[PDB]
Ligand SMILES: [Ca+2]
Ligand SMILES: [Ca+2]
Ligand SMILES: [Ca+2]
Ligand SMILES: [Ca+2]
Ligand SMILES: [Ca+2]
């Protein structure tokens with residue numbers, strides 16, 4: 001499974017998402033408990049704009065590794081990119097329970113509230129992001 005997974009990664013890194021998906025699928029045929037292969041399959045679908053499918057595969061990754069702050073964050077992002085800002089908030093909150101020093105997750109939580117039209121909440125979360133990283 002590891003060799004097919006790393007072949008998929010190399011294709012992913014050169015932007016060949018169709019081939020990455022094929023080889024991640026082969027990895028998952030050999031090891032259906034690879035949280036890494038489920039996550040990277042979700043990422044390849046995310047890169048193609050296929051958020052519905054990305055969410056299915058992130059959910060599988062989270063069944064195997066529920067302490068994946070990464071999967072929770074990208075699951076949030078897959079809803080955010082669709083305009084599903086209240087779903088995004090739930091998964092950014094879960095990412096931040098696991099990694100409360102993630103300036104990225106706080107910032108994106110603020111962005112979701114901004115997009116919901118709650119500017120006072122956006123301000124709180126942006127202030128938290130800027131406390132952790134005042135450079136952007
Ligand atoms: Ca669909
Ligand atoms: Ca849909
Ligand atoms: Ca489809
Ligand atoms: Ca983890
Ligand atoms: Ca949609």
Ligand SMILES: [Ca+2]
Nearest residue numbers: 083084085086
């Ligand atoms: Ca909504």
Ligand SMILES: [Cl-]
Nearest residue numbers: 052053055056
């Ligand atoms: Cl769906």
Ligand SMILES: [Cl-]
Nearest residue numbers: 052082083084
């Ligand atoms: Cl929908």
